[PDB]
Structures are given as C-alpha cells and as structure tokens.
Design a protein around this ligand. Structure first.
Ligand code: TEX
Ligand code: TEX
Ligand code: TEX
Ligand code: TEX
Ligand code: TEX
Ligand code: TEX
Ligand code: SAH
Ligand code: SAH
Ligand code: SAH
Ligand code: SAH
Ligand code: SAH
Ligand code: SAH
Lengths: 282, 281, 281, 279, 279, 279
C-alpha cells in the first residue's frame, strides 16, 4: 500500500523484469556468494567482501596442501604476507616468503611483527628464479599466482631444488586454451606484469622437466573471472581516487584494457590449482 | 618471458596496493564458488551469477525443508525457476502468484517445458488479497518480494492460507538508519519501492499477523554482491540495455545505482527468517 | 519366562496408550543423546543433564566462534564452567561478572583448580553498571542472564565495553501472549523475575542499544526439557532439598513449577541471537 | 522487575539447587541437536515423540536396508517405526505383535499412507513365527525381546532370515545379580522377563546361529526415556487414574521409584547388529 | 598354550618380518573404511569387489550424471559400472566394447535387472564410434584408453558429446622412459599400448578440443589392485591353468613381478575430468 | 601399437580372470579413501604402512583420549601407536611388552622424536603388571591378547585402570570349533593361543569387572592384512630366508594358505570398548 501499488509493480516487471535475467541469471533473486558457515563481514564495501573471499581462498589452499606442524614452508612470491601469516597461525609452521618488491617485504615483516611472529615468519627480497636457500630446506611450498611474472622453467626447477624429497609444491597457474593475438599478449605486459601463460601440455612438460610428479589439478577459473570482475568494478567506480594515487596514465590504461582483458580471460584461458610432488628418493 | 624481476619489483612497488584497495588484504583470487561446485558452462558474469542463484535456491529449500507430497505457496514467484527446482528436488506441488502477466506466462512455459504442469501452478494474483482458501498450503515462502507489498497485509494473507503448524520462509530487508527522503525515493524509481521496515517494526508485524519466529540469518553480503553484479552488468552493457528497455530506464539506473549501493551497505540489512503459524494441540 | 504371550498381549491391550500418552507416537526410547556423544560416567539425571549442558556450551562456542588471543566478557558468568570451556577450547581470555559472591568465589577456584587464573578473571560486578572501560572486549555473551536485569541498560553497557565490530551472543526468552499477573509474579517468586519482553520490543531495545542483529535460532524445546528435568529432580528429592534450602523454598517450587511449565510452553519462546556492534568507517 | 542485590542473595542461597538438578553449569542442556526441527508444541509428549522419531531414523540408518527388500518388525507396536522405514527406504515391512489393539492401530497406518501392498501388520507370536523359511532380507526387535523367550524368538528370527541378512536387536542386560523384588518389579510394572547377562545373551545369539557385527550402548537414552515416563505419570496421576484405573497408577508410582535405581545401577541397554552367515 | 618368555623370544627374532611386510606398526591396516558394510564372505575376490563397487560409487560422485541424461561408457567391460550408474542416478547408459563376450555379458546383466530400456550395450570401437554428433550428455573411459589410440579415441569422444558435457578419463602415464622389455611386457601381459607422458597426453587432450577441469592421482589403488591380482594368480595357478591354459598363466607368473616394479617406479595413474566446451 | 581385434579376442578368452581375482567389475578397487595422501612410494610395505596409520588414527578417534591423560599400551610393539597417540592427543603413554628388542626400538623412537618424558616403554607382562592400582585413565590392547591368558590380562588391566576409564580391545574370536591342526598352526605360525568364543570372551570381560560399551567387526581388515602379509612372504622368500632362516620361512610358506582359510571361515575380529565402572 506504500509508495507503490500492485499494478505498478506488475507493469514494471512486464516492461523490465528481463534486465534481472540478463544480469543475474535464470532467477530473480540473490546469488549465494558467501557460504552459510561463513561469518558476517565487518563492513560491506566490495573490498571487504572480496577480502573475506580471499581469506577463504587461503583457507582452501592450506587445506589442500596440508602443511604439518613443525614443518617449514616457502611462499614463492609472498606478496605482503597475509597468506603466510594465516598458514603459520593455523598449522603451527614456520614460513619463509620471498618477493622482488621492497615495500611488499617491508609490509610483510611489519605484519609478522604486529602479530608477534617474527620468529616463525621470515620475509626477504629474493628472486624465485635464483633462490638464496640451500637444497632441501623446505618441507613444502606454494607459488600462489606468481609464476606469471617469472620464467616457469627456472622458477619450478629452483623450487624443486629447495624442496625436500617427498615434499609438495602447490601451484596456482593460468593456461591458454586458444591462441592469443599479439594485442592480447601485450595487455598481459601493460596491465599487469606480463608473461603470457603457456599451454596445458607445455606447462606440464615444464613440470616434468623440473622433476615433478603431478598429483592433482582443479579448475578454479570461475573464481578468477569473478575476481577480475570485482577488480574492474572497483576501478570503474573509483577512477578519481585511483588517478590521484597512481596517476592518469596507469588508471586510464586499466579502464581501456580491462574490458578486452576480461573477454580474453573468459574465452581463451583457464586457471587451476595443481599439486606437484618432488619424488621421494632417486 | 616478457618481463624481468626488477621490472616486476618496480611495478608492485608503485601499483601493488591497487589490489589491496579493490580485492582485499591479500593479492589473489577469492573463493567465490565453493570447491564442490561444478564448473560453469560459461565464464560470463550472468552464467556465474545464475549458478550462484541456483545454489541460493538449494539453500532455501534445505532451510525450509518441504516434505514429499506437500503443497507450497510461492509468494511472488517471479518466472518460476525457484518453484521448479523445489518441485523436482522434494516431490511437492507448488503454487506461485505474481502481479506480472509476463512473469506468470514464463513460469507456465517453464512448467510445460519440464512436463510438470500438474505439479506447478502459476497464477496472476495479489499476495495482499490472495484468492486461495483458508489452510490450503503446508508451507510458503516470499523470496525477496515483500518489498513490493504492504507487509502487514501480505503476512496476514500468508498466515491465513497456511495450515496451522506449517512454516513461511521470508527473505526480507530492514533499515538500520533513518533513510533520507532522496533515499526513500530511489527505492521507488530504481526498483518498485516500499522502503524496508525497522527490525522491531517488522517483527511487530510478524507477531501481529500471528506468526512465531523460529530463525533469522543475515545474508546482507549476498545482497551487496548481487547488487554489485547487477551494477557491473548495467555499467558495461549500457548500449545493449538502452536498445532493449529505452534510454530513460537505463539512464535512471546509471544515475542511481551508486547511491543506492551506498545506502544498502550503510543503512540496511538483509536476512532469511523462518516464521511458524502455531499449531493447535 | 515369567510372562506368556497372552499376558503381554492383554497388557498392551489395556495399557499401551500410557506409553503413547507419555513418550510419543512410538513405543521405544528417545534419541536424547546423539550417537557420537560419549557414554556418561553414571546414569543419574543430574550428570546426564550436565553432559547436555556441556554440549550446550560446545554449541555456543561454535556459534560465537571466538578466535585465539581474544578477550571475552561473560555477562552473568555463574560459576564459570562456561568461561573455562571456552578458554580451554579457543585459547582466549575470559572476564566473567556476576552479582553473587558465592558464584564468583566458586568461579575463581575453578580457575585455580585448572591453573588458568591468568586467563580467567571473575569479579562481582553489575551488568547495568559495568566497571570496565570502553572498547575493552572483542566479544561477549549473556547466557540466560538478561532475565535478571534491565535489558536496555545491560545491552547498552555491553555495547559500550565491546570493541566496534565484535559480537555479543544472547540467550533470551520472549513472550508470545500477554501474561496474567499471577504468572508475572511466578517469575519473581520462583526464579529472579523480570517477565520476558516481546519480540519486537526486545529488538527495539537491541537496536536502541546500537546493535545489529545477525542471527536468531529457536531453542525453546531445550529450555522446556531442561525445565522438565529441573521439576523432576525437585519432585524426586523433596526431602533432600528441604534439609538444604529450607521448606519454604522447596514448597514454593513444588507449588509453582507446574504452572510455570505451562506458562513457558504456551506463552514464551527461547532463542539464541547474535548481535553485532557495528564497525569502522 | 527486580534489583541486582536481590538476585545476588538469591543465588548466594539457592544457586546450588541447579547444580544438584541440572549439572556443573547453570543453563539449558542441548537435548535436541541444532539441526532438528522446532516441534509443533512444547509438551513433554511431543518433544519425546520427536526424540522417538530421531531414534527411529538412527535405527534405519544403522541396519541400512536396501530398496526392494523385505524387513520383519518383531514386536512392531503401533507401527510408526515400520512406516518411517517404508517411506524412507522404499521397502516392504511386515510387523507382528501379540496385541490386537496395536495391530489394529498399525493397520490404521498402512491404510492412510497408501501402501498395503508394501506394509503389513499381523497378530502373531515371535516365538512361533508363521512365515516361511528364508523369506526376509533384514529384521529387527526394537525393545521387544524382554517379553519373549530370547532363545526361541532369536532362533525363530534366524530361520525366517535369508542367509547374509541382518537382525537389529535393541536389548537390555544385567550387570549385577538382581534381588527378587527387582525381578518381580519387572513383571508388575511392565511385562516381565528379567534381562540376561551379556555373555549369556551372546551364548544365545551364537546358539541361534548369529554372528555379531556391532554393539552400541544406548543406556543413557533408556534412562532419559524412563525419566520422561516417570515425570508424565507423576504430573498426570488424576488423568491416568480416570483412564487406566487406580490400581495401575498406584503400582506405577511405587515401582517407578525403586525401578529407576535398578535400571541405572544394574542394567545396560544396547543396539546390536546380528548377521545370519552366508556361504 | 604359550607363555610370555616365549612370545617375547619369538618377537626378538622375527618381529622385523612384520615390519618388513606390513609397515611401521605391527597391526592391521584400515583397508575398508569404518562406514563400509561387512562383506558377505572374506574371500579375496569379494573384498576386492566391494572395493571395486566403492570405486564405482566414487566415479559416479565425481562425474555427477543427472537424472534423465545419456552416458557413454567407452570400453564398458561387462557393464556393472553402467548398472550402478543407471540405478543410482536415474540415467540411460550406452556402453561400447570390442569384446563380444563382454557385451553379451552386459546385455545379459541388463536383462537380469530389468533395465534393458535404459542400458544399451554394443560391440563397437571407440576410435570409430558410429554414433551421431552430440548424442550424449556425459561419458567416461574407465581404464580402457590403454587399449586404444588415445588421439583417435578422445577426438571421437569429443565429437559424440554435447557441447558442455564432461568426459571422465581413468588413464596411466609414464614418469620415466621405459626400456624395450617393459614396453613388450605391456603387450604380452595385458593388451598393451605403453602409456604416454603427462604433457604429451594433455597435448592430445587439448588437440581433441577438451578443456581439463580436474586430475586426481589414484596410483596406489592401481598398485594395490595389481598386487591383489598377482596374489590371486600366484595362489591359484592350477585353477587358472585348467581354464586359461598353461601358456597364459605361465606368462603372468613370469612377468607380473617385473611389471609390478615398472608400475611402481615409472607410471602414475589418475582420474581426470575433461569438458567439451559449450558456446 | 596393438589393434582392436586383438584386444577383443583377448577379453573373449581371458576376461573372466579379472572377475575371478578382482570382483564383479573389471577396474581398480578403492583401497585408499579419496582424502588420503599419496604415499611416498608404491611398495606394498609403504601402502600397507599408510593403512596402518589410518588404522591407528581410527583407534585414537574411537577411544578418544583427552589431553593430560595417561594411557597404558598393553603389548605396545615397537611404539608407533603410542607415538601417534601422544602427538595427536597430548597425552602420556606407557607401553609394555615381553620383547626386549621391541621395547628397545620403542625407546629409540621416543628419543628420536624427543618424547622420552611423555613416552615410557618397559619390559613387563600384561598378566603380572607392575603398576599400582588405578594408575591410568585409559588403556588399549591392540591385537595382543592372543598372546596372553585373557582372564589374567583383562583383570590386570582392570586393576590398573581408574574407575570410569576405558579399555580399547582389538581381539579375535572363533565362530566354528577349530580342528587340532588349525590350533597348532596358531602356535607355530604366530605365538599362539587359539581365540575364545564370543560368549566365552564376554564372560571373561564381565568376570574381570568390565562393562561392554561397543563392538565393531573389522574382520575384512585383518583378512586383507593377512593377504598383504602372505604375498610379501611369497614374493621375498630369498630375502627372508637370508634374514630369518629357512626353517622359519618354510613354515610360513607351508602354513599361510591353510591359516588364511581358517581365518576366513572360522574366526571374526573386532574392536571393543570396555569400561571400568565409575563410583
Ligand atoms: C587476484 C587477481 C589479480 C587481479 C591480482 C593478483 C595476481 C597477479 C597480479 C598475477 C590477477 C591479475 C592477473 C592475473 C591473475 C592470476 C590470478 N590473479 C590474477 C592468474 C595468473 C597466474 O600466474 N595468470 C594469468 O595469466 C592471469 C590472467 C591474465 C589469466 N593474471 C596475469
Ligand atoms: C536480486 C537482486 C535485486 C537487484 C533484484 C530482485 C529483487 C527485487 C527487485 C525486489 C534486488 C533489488 C532490490 C532489492 C532486493 C532485495 C533482494 N534483491 C533485490 C531485498 C528486498 C527484500 O524485500 N528489500 C530491499 O529493500 C532491497 C534492497 C534495497 C535492500 N531491494 C528493494
Ligand atoms: C536452566 C534453567 C533454569 C531453571 C536455571 C538457569 C537460569 C536462570 C535461573 C535465569 C532457568 C530458569 C528460569 C528461566 C530460564 C531461562 C533459561 N534457563 C532458565 C531463560 C531466561 C533468559 O533470560 N528467561 C526466562 O524468562 C526464563 C523462563 C521463565 C522462560 N527463565 C526466567
Ligand atoms: C520406552 C521405554 C519403555 C518405558 C516402554 C517401551 C518398551 C517396553 C515396554 C518393553 C520401556 C519399559 C521397560 C523396558 C524397556 C526397554 C526399552 N524401553 C523400555 C528395554 C527392554 C528391551 O527388551 N528391556 C528391559 O529390561 C527394560 C528395562 C527394565 C531395562 N524394559 C523392560
Ligand atoms: C584392474 C587392473 C587391471 C589388472 C585389469 C583391468 C584393466 C585393463 C586390462 C586395461 C589392469 C591391467 C593393466 C593396466 C591397468 C590400468 C588399470 N587397471 C589395469 C590402467 C591403464 C589405463 O589406461 N593403463 C596402464 O598402462 C595400466 C598399467 C600398466 C599402468 N594397465 C595397462
Ligand atoms: C596384523 C597382522 C598379524 C599378521 C601380525 C600382528 C599381530 C599379531 C602377531 C598378534 C596378525 C597375525 C596373527 C593374528 C593377528 C590378529 C591381528 N593381527 C594378527 C588378531 C589376534 C587378536 O587377538 N587374534 C588372532 O587369533 C589372530 C588371527 C589368527 C585371527 N592372530 C593370531
Ligand atoms: N621473479 C620473482 N621472484 C620472487 N617473487 C616474485 C617474482 N615475480 C613476482 N614476484 C612476486 O609474486 C607476487 C605475486 S602477487 C601474489 C602475492 C601472494 N602470493 C598472495 O597470494 O597474496 C608479488 O608479490 C611479486 O612481488
Ligand atoms: N503484491 C504482490 N503480490 C504478489 N506478487 C507480487 C506482488 N508484488 C510483487 N510481486 C512479485 O514478486 C516477485 C519479486 S522478484 C522475485 C522473483 C522470485 N521470487 C524469484 O526468486 O526469482 C515478482 O515476480 C513480482 O511480480
Ligand atoms: N511374544 C511376542 N511376539 C511378538 N510380539 C510381541 C511379543 N510380546 C510382546 N510383543 C510386542 O512387542 C512390542 C514391544 S513395545 C515396542 C513397540 C515397537 N517395536 C516400537 O518401537 O514402537 C509390543 O507392541 C508387543 O505387542
Ligand atoms: N545484574 C546482573 N549483572 C551481572 N550478572 C548478573 C546480574 N543479575 C544476575 N546475574 C548473574 O547471571 C547469572 C545467571 S545464571 C547463568 C550462569 C552462567 N551464565 C551459565 O551459563 O551457567 C547468575 O549467576 C547471576 O549471578
Ligand atoms: N578400441 C576399443 N574400443 C572400444 N572398447 C575397447 C577398445 N579396446 C578395449 N576396449 C574395451 O575396454 C575395456 C577395458 S577393461 C575396462 C572395463 C570397464 N570399463 C569396467 O570398468 O569394468 C574392455 O572391456 C574392452 O572390451
Ligand atoms: N604377555 C604379554 N605381556 C605384555 N606384552 C605382550 C605379552 N605377550 C605379547 N606381548 C606383546 O604384544 C605385542 C603384539 S604385536 C602388537 C604390537 C602393537 N600393539 C601394535 O599395535 O603394533 C608384541 O609387541 C608383544 O611383545
């Protein structure tokens, strides 16, 4: 009886209800983006909900690789340290993370210090294609969405060298399914930091050449497409803020490229989580 | 091998924090789809959202728990995919009412295409004056539709058509702030209005219709993510939707969605409650 | 072999309906203890009731979900076993308050007996005038204690001492009828009173303190079974209790529990709600 | 309303009645698992019925009968157990009982939920089963063996079972020796036959030809069920005297007191899976 | 009948044989999960069959065929996998195999269960499927791809699948290079075709047009099954020579041990889910 | 590469060897649950050892020892079961055995894992335990009662157990009568004592003062372990003769098949939880 009548609502759905079906799917209600057992976020900015989704992602990687208490883990391209902190907190392990970014490693040590875990969390500026660690120093390791900045043959061989025999390396890598055009290969360099993904058979030829066995692979491509959407929406809606922080040239490059890059990702690539084992004894 | 380590190092120094501004406290994907979920047919935003909708529907079915051979009233049934899934999964008959001829036509087409026109009935009817008798339905649900209705009439109507002891599942929004007058109007201009009630106000209505309250569970994040998915689809497909629904309609969406997203985040909450019509001992 | 088939048949011919009147639509045991629960140490009603209490505590910890290194306020902490189990299971510090000197002393000795006096602090304080300062605790819970206090004051005082973004678990009763004056008095003479408010009234209080509502789940059948266990122990051990608490107290319970049981069944509900103090920005 | 100091003196003097009656905490027990449904009402009889249905769900789940099989309910009662098994697993259930009332009330169930070609309820003796050898796939005697001769009934259940099928048994057993007033209380309150000893019971199970595959103690469930039964009789003495007669109620009251102590201290109650071997 | 200072003597001398054979403990292995049912007997072939059925269940759960769909069983054997899938998911299953004896046994099995309308079994070659383009919703090749040209079989599976359907594949792959005697053993013992390599196999998968959604190693199940098979042949040489001829059995006896070592040290066995893309 | 026609004729002749050895299907058995980790190698000893550890994890889960308790391992072997229990549950374990070598290997294990303060391994007899009355909160006898006088062992375990504590027992029991040659094979192959009967065993359990809280058949697990053991002895006759002597190995090769049949046809093996009643 309030500001709308039934005939107004039915006429509205007669004219426009198909916009909900074109955007949300074969029904006209919410999607269950957060599982029921998940907790209610602190706030509801798109960044916070995305952040909780990231933590659940990290929980799933921990669960998959299954590091055991008292083991030492290597975070290949550790970003700003949250993944390692959660893995160490949950499994009671030591974690050493490497990254080529100074500010990133500083924020990761700041993080370890804020939680009183500088004795079990070690963050250093190192190249994954030339690790500064001995042979067989780590029980397990993971390359979470980092291999696309590196030579995969060098990074995988180096990870094989620093792993104890019988240990596992969890990999989160992308793969092309169709042949990319040259403009698409350039968007990899200009938008993010480059290296087009290899092919599926090509990627596992490199994994075999590094001396790894393959124990599992699981497609998570939808998760990459939703995250790339969350990103593109945040950039579109906050152009002024991001231009005042990162510049016009950078932001304008994202606005002009994110569309074509999303279509490329949707139609031509796949993203997966693979478990690689260094064989025991040889 | 298109870049070197130092190039990548410099890039994440200058820009790496843009991922922290958009994606969260880490720099990787979110687990938007649970691990046991099937891979979608497409990676289009609509197809991914559609699978999230169906998992949403699986959850509501699980929560209300209709038993085989029961009759369920779908208050504001849309185009009937919720009713179809509930019918296939539990072996129930479902009657859905909506005020849109087009939606009811689509829901009847759906029941015919799936050969279930004897277990799925879809009628054009008002929930605030349901034509059905008294104590006709074992359970019912109003999935995101009370916001179009006067909730006191619709909940009393739902109570009357429910057999004593059955349950009505409700997916309703509620204000936490006061709402400015421009914010109240956006409900009417963007969607089809009725500003959400207050918590105590809503449950005074729930009691006034004679319902007990069995459960309530917040789902505000699913609504904020869904509204996000909607806003992204409108933003990126403006040309297509203007050619389909007219410039005036899409322009209004482009003009209001940001402010409506802000109001939803900061002033409302969205929940799934189970109301019970008390049984006579 | 002290019965024949004819005798057992004639017995159920004459009397089987007493089982159906007492135990339900079946003539066998109830699954009162889930299959994965351990076999109790004995079979006294009190110990079987206590194991159900611990599983009750286990479920509250699972629902509130306190994380390691946090500080939890127990509003009406009793003798502190709830605080102890939460502390042992989650690696948290717990500060419990109560207005009874005997309970706080027993709670402090429970912390000393388990060697946890440094993580468990029990003090004699009022929940409507908490002595702790603003934003002191990460989370809190009031387990069946709000019926002794002014709910508006206790909740506002719980809101003040919580850190923004923390959660308060509440186990509260609510009326569904109006309550006669003899019943409202029975609250005072049997327990320690305060008739329960109404659903919308309670949530107007919860909103008025500043809380958002995230979950509600009905646990009325649990409170009814607990109350039934309580009444059976009083009926079965009148002589024991009159020698310990005095004839006046026990007789008052004997005279009131039947009427209180009916009032609880037909006029009240009992739920567990999760209230959040809002967050930053 | 009340003041704080009133509440403080109250628990200072009466708080321990809760620990004497409810346990080492001062709150509710989780008597109903969180995933269970909110009952239609809060009456002791209705809540107790829901726990009976959860009990029945669990037995079906334990025995795990398969679709298209035929199950024997030895001592079917009024047949709600047999009904829930038939709806949930798509099986046929034949129930027997020595009571014309309970078989009548069970046919009252086979009628409505339109089955009759699946369900079945007959007045028969378990120690004298009328059925043909090797006719069933599974069976169960749910709290019923205490009215019969366990040796005859179990041998009779073995004969009617196909080789390879399973017999679920919900039986009680003594852990002490039992005095004569206790053994008589078994006959005057219920319908008698004192429980055997554990090794004794399984010598019988072996003698009928059964292998043992499982055993699980449910004695806390029987103690709670008997506490609920006691509370109902205590609170409704006038109602049950107006129905069953004063003789019944008076004997119940006296026996119930000095029977709960014997059940708690001298008996155990369990669910056992017995198998008829299949070479 | 024995004493302590006699059992300890025994373990002082031989306890190491328990560790050499069974592992780092001296007790049983949990070979059957605690929720599995007791087998009908304890013969090795039965316990292995129950594991085979639980294996089938896992494949059903993995591919997840939905009610009303049509499933192609590429290399269906004698059809028990097709039977369970049809009964459990309400689907239609068409299975092909190049063995006339197996297909006869599979249609015989379908007739005995009354499912000849939902179970079709034909003699055909998976490298030359006679079926129409986009005829099946889903498909699976259970341990059959080692008898085929995997490029011809996967492209032909890709053609007969509807766009968006899934193909479950159970395949082996080498991790070392293999000597010539080992490659020969593949042909003489079983029906041959040495497994490809990992990137080589997925070059084939991508070339047929399949996207790869999952891969899961099951190599221990294959090695444990190969041992159960070898122990069966070792134990019943006389029985198997009387039915399959001395030439066949002596070949298995002379090659099983070396083939086991090749399997252990040079090959891995996985379940993988391949999707035909939908546009 | 081999062709189709050849594969067809191959299964036409040799197909049924799989249904005779592997079961009603022609594929792998799910010997390892899907959530189990991939073993380090594929040797039969390593896969069996992983099965042994999941077995231990199950016994731990079943007895459910709580942090800070003291467990008595009766017949503790070389200590890995005690180590896993101490690591997972944060408990102290005391294990006894009559074998000096085994105890030395367990004290070795405690030292290497730095758990000598929580792990104690001593040479003692379960039928004459040296510990005081009511010393341990729980205990378990994992496949070791077969070496002892079960009456003496159980009553002894009862004495050292605190009231209310539990004893996990993994015992076998005869279902047939056993010929005298089979009884002798118990003594010569292992270290003897024929198993008791089901009612006999529980007359002892009750004679020792224990209540029975559970029983679960695990016969398939023991039977498969005995097959794993037999295959290993068969396949490594040369290595084991060079290690333990020809006399011992020839005895195993002569008796293992007969013992296998006896175990399959005449005995069952189960896990039972016994409780010392509380006061
Ligand atoms: C959180 C999502 C952000 C937005 C940020 C974090 C990760 C970075 C910058 C590498 C992301 C961007 C680009 C990304 C990926 C990836 C995960 N997240 C990716 C997969 C990546 C693995 O190496 N490979 C690819 O090719 C993709 C894409 C073009 C298919 N890519 C270059
Ligand atoms: C699928 C999401 C779409 C986008 C479309 C389908 C549903 C419609 C049009 C009602 C949606 C829009 C507005 C919506 C909601 C709702 C769910 N979905 C909502 C909750 C609604 C329940 O009554 N209440 C509200 O106030 C909200 C919002 C402003 C908080 N609202 C008016
Ligand atoms: C363990 C059950 C004992 C018996 C004891 C522990 C708790 C006390 C004394 C407060 C109990 C008594 C009265 C109780 C409740 C309650 C839980 N347990 C209650 C719910 C309470 C929450 O505030 N509200 C009510 O109104 C109820 C009832 C009349 C509906 N009440 C006054
Ligand atoms: C629902 C509980 C009611 C109250 C009613 C239903 C069952 C009947 C009447 C047999 C019950 C009464 C007596 C009962 C049992 C039993 C279950 N329920 C029992 C176990 C029974 C199994 O044969 N054995 C016994 O000895 C017990 C008891 C004295 C240990 N008994 C005689
Ligand atoms: C039940 C196990 C039996 C013994 C029988 C059933 C299957 C047959 C005859 C193909 C088997 C034999 C050989 C087998 C396999 C296989 C599964 N079972 C295999 C995996 C196969 C998949 O293509 N690939 C291989 O290479 C293997 C092996 C040498 C690694 N192989 C040729
Ligand atoms: C693990 C496998 C090994 C092979 C070795 C470890 C355990 C030993 C030697 C006791 C084993 C052998 C004989 C064994 C058992 C047993 C478990 N493992 C048994 C059950 C035992 C329990 O008391 N009882 C029996 O009689 C059996 C059998 C003949 C039925 N037995 C003498
Ligand atoms: N060659 C290289 N050696 C080491 N780290 C590298 C690298 N190239 C890129 N990286 C690092 O890999 C990271 C990829 S972003 C992923 C961050 C982190 N794995 C997370 O999940 O949050 C960046 O932090 C970048 O600094
Ligand atoms: N007064 C009223 N009476 C009955 N239905 C109404 C109504 N006002 C709005 N509706 C219907 O409620 C629906 C809300 S959109 C939700 C659609 C559906 N519940 C789904 O889950 O997909 C629309 O179909 C609209 O037609
Ligand atoms: N000798 C006998 N033969 C067959 N049934 C008997 C019997 N003696 C008693 N019974 C039946 O066993 C039942 C025990 S009461 C248990 C009822 C039912 N199994 C339930 O769970 O609800 C009674 O209904 C009684 O009629
Ligand atoms: N005004 C008040 N402020 C703080 N605590 C109070 C109070 N009024 C009553 N209480 C306490 O609240 C408790 C309720 S009984 C609940 C005990 C405990 N929470 C448990 O879970 O077992 C009593 O112990 C009483 O001492
Ligand atoms: N080229 C080919 N085309 C079709 N089927 C083939 C084939 N080569 C072998 N096969 C079949 O593949 C089967 C391999 S044994 C696997 C049997 C079945 N998948 C099961 O799970 O039991 C054999 O039955 C054989 O008949
Ligand atoms: N009389 C006795 N007293 C104590 N231990 C005995 C014994 N007789 C045999 N044992 C021990 O019981 C063990 C049986 S082998 C079982 C090993 C261990 N329990 C495990 O689970 O792996 C041997 O270590 C043997 O030394």
């Amino acid at each position: 009886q309030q500001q709308v009548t039934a005939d107004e609502v039915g006429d509205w759905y007669d004219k426009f209800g198909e916009v909900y079906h074109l955007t949300l799917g074969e029904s006209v209600h919410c999607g269950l983006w957060f599982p029921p057992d998940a907790p209610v976020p602190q706030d509801m900015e798109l960044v916070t909900m995305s952040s909780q989704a990231q933590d659940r992602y990290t929980d799933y990687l921990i669960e998959t690789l299954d590091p055991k208490a008292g083991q030492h883990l290597l975070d290949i391209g550790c970003g700003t340290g949250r993944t390692a902190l959660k893995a160490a907190r949950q499994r009671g392990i030591a974690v050493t993370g490497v990254a080529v970014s100074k500010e990133q490693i500083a924020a990761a040590n700041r993080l370890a210090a804020g939680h009183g875990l500088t004795e079990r969390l070690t963050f250093e500026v190192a190249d994954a294609m030339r690790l500064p660690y001995e042979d067989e120093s780590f029980d397990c390791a993971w390359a979470i969405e980092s291999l696309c900045h590196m030579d995969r043959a060098k990074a995988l061989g180096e990870a094989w060298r620093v792993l104890k025999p019988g240990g596992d390396l969890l990999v989160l890598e992308s793969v092309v399914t169709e042949e990319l055009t040259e403009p698409e290969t350039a968007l990899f360099e200009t938008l993010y930091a480059a290296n087009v993904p290899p092919r599926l058979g090509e990627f596992f030829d490199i994994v075999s050449g590094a001396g790894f066995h393959t124990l599992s692979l699981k497609d998570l491509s939808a998760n990459l497409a939703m995250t790339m959407n969350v990103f593109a929406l945040g950039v579109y809606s906050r152009r002024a803020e991001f231009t005042e922080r990162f510049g016009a040239e950078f932001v304008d490059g994202l606005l002009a490229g994110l569309g074509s890059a999303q279509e490329t990702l949707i139609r031509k690539t796949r993203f997966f989580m693979a478990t690689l084992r260094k064989p025991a004894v040889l």
